[PDB]
Amino acid sequence: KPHRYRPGTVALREIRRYQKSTELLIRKLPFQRLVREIAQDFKTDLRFQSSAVMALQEASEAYLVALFEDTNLCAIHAKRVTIMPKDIQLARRIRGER
Amino acid sequence: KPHRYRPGTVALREIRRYQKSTELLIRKLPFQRLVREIAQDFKTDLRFQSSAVMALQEASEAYLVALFEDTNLCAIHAKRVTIMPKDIQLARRIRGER
Amino acid sequence: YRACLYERVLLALHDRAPQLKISDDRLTVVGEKGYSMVRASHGVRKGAWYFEITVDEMPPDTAARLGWSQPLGNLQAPLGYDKFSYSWRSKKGTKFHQSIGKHYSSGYGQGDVLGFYINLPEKQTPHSEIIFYKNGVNQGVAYKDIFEGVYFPAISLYKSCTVSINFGPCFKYPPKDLTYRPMSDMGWGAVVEHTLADVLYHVETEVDGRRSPPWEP
Amino acid sequence: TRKESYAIYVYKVLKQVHPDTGISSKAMSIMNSFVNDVFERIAGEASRLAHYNKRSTITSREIQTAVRLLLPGELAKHAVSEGTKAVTKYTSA
Amino acid sequence: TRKESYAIYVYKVLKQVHPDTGISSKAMSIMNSFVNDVFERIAGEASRLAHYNKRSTITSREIQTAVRLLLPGELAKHAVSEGTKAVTKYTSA
Amino acid sequence: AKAKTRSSRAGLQFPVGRVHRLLRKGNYAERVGAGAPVYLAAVLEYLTAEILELAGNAARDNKKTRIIPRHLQLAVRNDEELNKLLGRVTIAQGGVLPNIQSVLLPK
Amino acid sequence: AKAKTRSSRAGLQFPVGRVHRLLRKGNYAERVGAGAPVYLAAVLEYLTAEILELAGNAARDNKKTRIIPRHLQLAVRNDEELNKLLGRVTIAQGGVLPNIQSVLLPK
Amino acid sequence: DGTLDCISMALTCTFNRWGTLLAVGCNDGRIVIWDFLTRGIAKIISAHIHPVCSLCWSRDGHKLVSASTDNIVSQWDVLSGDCDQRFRFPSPILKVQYHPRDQNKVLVCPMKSAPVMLTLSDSKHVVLPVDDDSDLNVVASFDRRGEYIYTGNAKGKILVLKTDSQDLVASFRVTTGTSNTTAIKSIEFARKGSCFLINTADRIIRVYDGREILTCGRDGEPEPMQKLQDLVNRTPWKKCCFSGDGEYIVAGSARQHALYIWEKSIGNLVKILHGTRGELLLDVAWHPVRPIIASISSGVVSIWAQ
Amino acid sequence: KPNYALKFTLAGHTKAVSSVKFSPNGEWLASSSADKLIKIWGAYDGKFEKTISGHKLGISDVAWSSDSNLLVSASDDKTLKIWDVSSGKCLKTLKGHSNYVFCCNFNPQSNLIVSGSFDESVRIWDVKTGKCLKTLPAHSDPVSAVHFNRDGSLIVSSSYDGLCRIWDTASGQCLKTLPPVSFVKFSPNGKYILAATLDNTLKLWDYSKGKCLKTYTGHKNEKYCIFANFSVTGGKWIVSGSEDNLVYIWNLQTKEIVQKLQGHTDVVISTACHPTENIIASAALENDKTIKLWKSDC
Amino acid sequence: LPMPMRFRHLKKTSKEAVGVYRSPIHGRGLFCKRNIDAGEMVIEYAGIVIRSILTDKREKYYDSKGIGCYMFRIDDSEVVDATMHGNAARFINHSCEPNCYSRVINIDGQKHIVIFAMRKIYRGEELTYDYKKLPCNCGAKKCRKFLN
Amino acid sequence: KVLRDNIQGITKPAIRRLARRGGVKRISGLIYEETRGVLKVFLENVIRDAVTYTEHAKRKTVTAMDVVYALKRQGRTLYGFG
Amino acid sequence: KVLRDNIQGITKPAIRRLARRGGVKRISGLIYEETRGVLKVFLENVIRDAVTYTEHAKRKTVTAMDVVYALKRQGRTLYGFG
DNA sequence: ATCGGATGTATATATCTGACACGTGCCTGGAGACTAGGGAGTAATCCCCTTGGCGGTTAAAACGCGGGGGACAGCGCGTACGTGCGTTTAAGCGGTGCTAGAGCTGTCTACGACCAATTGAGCGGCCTCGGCACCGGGATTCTCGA
DNA sequence: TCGAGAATCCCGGTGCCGAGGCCGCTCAATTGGTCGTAGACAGCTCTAGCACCGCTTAAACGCACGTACGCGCTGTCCCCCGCGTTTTAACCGCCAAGGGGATTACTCCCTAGTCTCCAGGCACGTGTCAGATATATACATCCGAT
């Protein structure tokens, strides 16, 4: 008979190993393309350092995991294990991002 | 027969008039005594400007109503009209106050 | 209402050329290229009156012109280029009208505080005349032939000329006539007259009927 | 002891915008403090940038750049225009 | 281009605290950036307080006061004591 | 020796000379751009104009000639750009803009 | 006259000469106090000692000689006062210190 | 009968008002405006990165509306090639169509949503009504003068609205003969007169006269002017079109890459044109004032004169 | 700008002329008047063709057939009358309007008639049987002018109550509702509508927009039903009469007066533009009783 | 741009720039049909240019005919009377908050009263200026409640 | 003159007044003292930092500009006090 | 070379990976695009401000120190890049 | 869902006033004019990082696919919280009075500023080699059905 | 709940390049005068703070009490986790062109610095009305009976 772990369990271990790991979790090229797309909005044909864009993606992902973290916390205060967009919105609200 | 307004209603009007009013809502002397009590902790027998302490109390109360405000908002995301201490704690958490 | 942005009867900013600069420290007028013309706030229609021009700067390449001009006076022209303007050239006292210069006049000085007297009646206007004074001293009659139509005191600038108009209550050498009126007096007279003009026009359009006293005044 | 302020200037611009509307001294000092704060904002930012440029001189281009950094969108745009106007009016002196 | 850093002194004080340890050059750069951050922080705060004191001279009293403003509790206390001992040592000769 | 201040030379109000002396005494750069004070003061003029204008809007919205700091708070809270500019800033006698959440109303 | 570094007379490791250079080049005051760079550099050395010590603790706990940024981030989120000093700071290759919530646990 | 080597990835073409220029879309998402007289390309426009599947000229000919496969519609000046306006929607666009008597207005048939009529002056939009509320596939077209809108659903229902009010001015459902509906593949009109055609899933083209639908009223039984099909092969029709005058009708058998030509009044087959048996027929158009016919198949355009 | 000059002066109606219309072929000019008489005249030489009588009261309007073979006459006798223009025979007499019939017009296919009367109701009539097929309480005041669109799908109606109402033909549906409007008609392209109001003002409205596009003033019209026509055979103009004995011609686009034809002594009561030539028939009221042909070169 | 060139452009674009429709202000009024920028020429109040002394004789004349006076003072000497002969500018309502403003220009020696835009006016907007007891219904929050 | 326990000098009516100003309808008791704590903690910083300024100011009285520069350094700047 | 729609280039697996790093168990779909938006908005500032630096830098390439000073000015400073 | 009554709130009025607009005489920072240096600007050169493309891989993403797990809706109750009314209480006005300490001026002096002469601490650059990263494989431990 | 199985931990071995150590090679640090000056300090005010004390009262605390949201539990739906498969394009490695970045060397425009003079700003008086406050009033809105 096929076995399937209970829900979250696999995701739980994923959480554990991700707090274990430290490297990026975003594919480089898509992020870079997104950055250049954003750039051409303000000015077209602008070049970048690989170090620069690595910094961009690292700092972003840091802000992003922080947002995910405190939104997780808020959802704890929301007594749910599922996340709700309003949690993120109000988190930014408390983060003065509104 | 005696009349009693339904709950919140009186408090609702209080909210309305307080957003209407702008002056302080803290008695001066108790706040001042608290400030001087806090002061003697770091150094005893220190004097103050009435303007200085007025600034202290105004800025405090501002921070305080901001905290009450966004904690109200969070409690909205908590789907409750009653406030919970965890709301304030996690609000400070998002406010980076932890 | 025709409310005028002025504490006293001054050189109206509404009737200056775009190349005409003013300094309200002395309400002097100045220009940069060629000639231009500015006028006061008030305008005479009858009676005799009087004002002055004070000159604060007259280099050799600086020649102001000072006099009177009726409406139709192109404020870019040098105050006398048309037949509706009569002025004096501030190099030598020379009466300029129809762009024609006439030496039927006295001599002008660089620091002249010049008085300007002019009488229009209530095809020359009957018994109307213009008299020019240097610091009150009679420089003489300038123009006896005066055409109809309201006139106003005007100043023409050449390249960087500094002159200013001035009323009566702060005068230096005033005539002691009891009939002539300073600039301020005719100024508030015309202001009140145009107030009544607004009154009467709003009456006409707003309420049926009009009525005015025994005509003479 | 002479204590400088800008109540004269804030009142001037008030009249220039609202000759009718008055002003309270409390809100006056509020305005003064605020403009001091934002001026220090722009000063620190421009100095930081020039230090990044390692340029010991602080010019108007720095100011434009740093206010663009400071202001939310269109304000800056509007802002810079008048600023340019100013220097033009002053360069045309 | 002659670029200046502190990783050598990082290695020095490391050996002073941990002789048998290596570092990632990445981590060294991170630490150096941190050095720069705390330096600019303390310098700006000191200049600002001196401005409040209208002082044009930034001295060790300013240093200690600004550190106390910045560092918390025993961090600040130990740092104050250390700076005090060091300036005492330097002033001793 | 004709005198004319740089503010008049810019036809503006904020004191270019005063602000220049201020930035000089502010210890930010060794030399300065002479037009930078003009430019910055013009920017200040602009932003001050907008904020005081909104303040007066609220004021005569409340039949108030002399503007109150509450007008200031309301103004700075209404405009998105200015609020963003002064989000973490506090205002004396500011109070809170009118704001009631949806579920707060009884049904 | 032999030239010894002022940090030697201070008995410290960071170059106080470079310090005072950045100070004068930093446009903070018209003239820097003599012992002020000394004091601040001493503070800097002390705090660096603290952070590097915490990092070595973490790395040896992880049985690691070469100390990777992860160790430092963990120590950062392990020191409360240092965290307070640096909670507003982001950390490259930092990740997140292991934090598990209660209701997250299974049963 | 004559092809063009200078254009590649031909996907969709459209004659100008006078049949002098031809704007063809390419897989790269480029507009190639090719001229008939000089027999050369007149313009190249970087329209989209996505191929263009819908192209229409303006009446003055100075504007072309283009639809990418990225659900990106854009208006371009033919002289300059600039993107005059650009919009995006859900349910990727199936077709665009300038209003013939008001180039400011343009109807758009999306994939899953109802056709919407927008204007260029104001970026507004009017969602046209849907009879059955569950078609999810309705083709729509202006009439010859742009006075009415003909909308046909996948369920054979045909609504005639007025272009200004979107009010139902006529209605009827086409039949498969017995009792069944058929997916309305396309609605075409004549640039001259009032005869129009419908391509349906039954592989049977139905020619009507719009006046007869208008006088038929709502929910009536209007018979076609003509019924046209390949009684021999029973071939579907990827694309059909009238002649410039409106007395000849052509159908493109993409099944066997052929072209059938019937008349209007009699309806007898004029002729058949056979293309490369290996080519997949995609697009079909007729010269508006010439017996010239443009075909797009396997990215290659062919010309058929008479 | 036009240079219309008087070429032929026409007269003979014993009473006030109420309408003059060019035949669609431009061969004849039909002139109706309150004298119960219609007068067909030569459209190019001013030659009086004939007089057609039979109406019992004054005639307020007359309209040609598209084939230039029939003429509908709306008279104050509450009756319409359809006549063969070639024989002058009263082919039909339309009864059913309860009061004075003021306007009448054929459908673009000439097989149907629209009629407005003082009864403030618009009647819709057969031609081949002359039978009233519809009747609509259109306005709250006597109808001034009714007219068909380019195809006969829409009927525009004006009346003294100041309303300009577009109605569906097949159903009588009051499609749209846009100053006492004395005249109204569709544009040649059916896209616009020209309506005269009794305040010296003409208004061209967009139908698809329902808003006035252009306005035309300078003339005088405040009491009488002064007609307006589109001058198209030469330049695009708007020609109308005026209560100042003038024949006003404005530019169509710029709305500016492009000509003023004088020579009429009474109010120029009716106007007609030639369908093919640059010819304009201007008929004045009883103090003139004359119709004048004007020919320009553009 | 030259006031003559600008005036030619204005007289060319006036017929398609503005319209007249039913107005919630009052009756019929001038609405914007294409976004009008600030300070640009909106419309001439074109009409009969007369001298001032002839105003009353005309006015009383209209007073004898029951026809409303459409006159605007060019200056102390001239007036554009549009009562009998005018343009669409006779349908510009007034607002205490105008997006437009009247100015007199001199083209080749003759004066023209042109309403320009006080601000960037957008399509659909009703055009109003400051005419400078009649109750007002302009809808502005600053409305004087009365033109007079 | 040794002070104490002025923290509870903050009245629950005052707290609920501030809450109503913040637009709050229903409140629990557990908040107030908690609230108070935060309050304390909050001011816990500024005064010290403030007197720190006064520390370097070498003065016995504490001024507003102290808390001004504190809130500035605390990123919570305030206006209206010079 | 005009770019577009790289925002959806952010994979939902990537988003959930970041969430798991943040210690999240159950997630809804409605988040991701929302997330993306925020992401965009977030970077919406910095790059501009960054190139603003590059603006004053009078250069065509964009450097790390740009975003360094941005995050600094954005109060989100980062280490390890000079 | 309405009406009646209670109550709370927006308004006009009157006057009081004290902030506040306004004007002064006097001060000094700002303007005006003049001199120097040297930061900044420009240009030619080098480098060299970047941006571009090309091919092979698969781990990763897309997509599908149950399906148990919880989001959520509802439903009972009950305890905690608004409220209005009691009670008592410090809060505020205000005005008094002392001076400790800010807050100012006048020295005088140590103290960097600064420059010049000197150089070795430090930094770019070059080997080098060993913890470290990867890999494969074996043993351990969680987990889901008994 | 005791196994099966699966993901993981750890162990040994392989190969590597960054961490590090050392080497030329300065310029920036030190040293030592030298000088004008920031402020350290003394020594005055005066005032704002600090405390005193009384008087009034709005305010605060507590009570009782209804009540209604918080909370706890149930059942449902759906839906997101987990795994399997299929597709792809990130990556990675390499190559190549140039275009910008950084550099240096001149060159000089502009600003710092100085000195002069005064005029706008500032402290300081001075009437004076915007609005604060109180009162009676008219309007809005809740709450309960119907």
Numbering used by the authors:
A (entry chain G), B (entry chain K): 37 to 134
C (entry chain D): 279 to 400, 440 to 534
D (entry chain J), E (entry chain N): 29 to 121
F (entry chain I), G (entry chain M): 12 to 118
H (entry chain A): 18 to 323
I (entry chain B): 32 to 209, 215 to 334
J (entry chain C): 3814 to 3945, 3954 to 3969
K (entry chain L), L (entry chain H): 20 to 101
List passages from the publication reporting this PDB structure:
To understand the molecular mechanism by which DPY30 regulates MLL1 activity on the NCP, we determined the single-particle cryo-EM structure of the human recombinant MLL1RWSA complex (4-MLL1), containing four of the five core proteins, i.e. RbBP5 (aa 1–538); WDR5 (aa 22–334); MLL1SET (aa 3762–3969); and ASH2LΔSDI (aa 1–504), bound to the NCP (4-MLL1-NCP). After several rounds of heterogeneous refinement using cryoSPARC57, we isolated four different subclasses of 4-MLL1-NCP (Class01, 02, 03, and 05). In the end, we obtained three different subclasses of 4-MLL1-NCP structures (Class 01, 02, and 05). In comparison to the MLL1RWSAD-NCP complex (or 5-MLL1-NCP), the 4-MLL1-NCP complexes displayed much higher dynamics at the ASH2L-NCP interface. While the majority of the 5-MLL1-NCP complexes anchored on the NCP with RbBP5 and ASH2L at DNA SHL 1.5 and 7, respectively, the 4-MLL1-NCP complex adopted multiple modes of interaction. With RbBP5 anchoring near SHL 1.5, ASH2L binding sites varied from SHL 7 to SHL 4.5 among different subclasses. Furthermore, local ASH2L binding dynamics on the NCP also increased significantly in the absence of DPY30, as demonstrated by extremely low or complete loss of ASH2L IDR density in a significant subset of the structures. The cryo-EM structure of the 4-MLL1-NCP complex shows significant rotational dynamics on the NCP as compared to the 5-MLL1-NCP, 5-MLL3-NCP or ySET1-NCP complexes. We envision that increased rotational dynamics of the 4-MLL1 complex or local ASH2L dynamics reduces the probability of the MLL1 SET domain positioning near nucleosome dyad. In this scenario, the MLL1SET domain has to go through multiple spatial arrangements to optimally engage both H3 substrates in the NCP, which negatively affect MLL1 processivity.
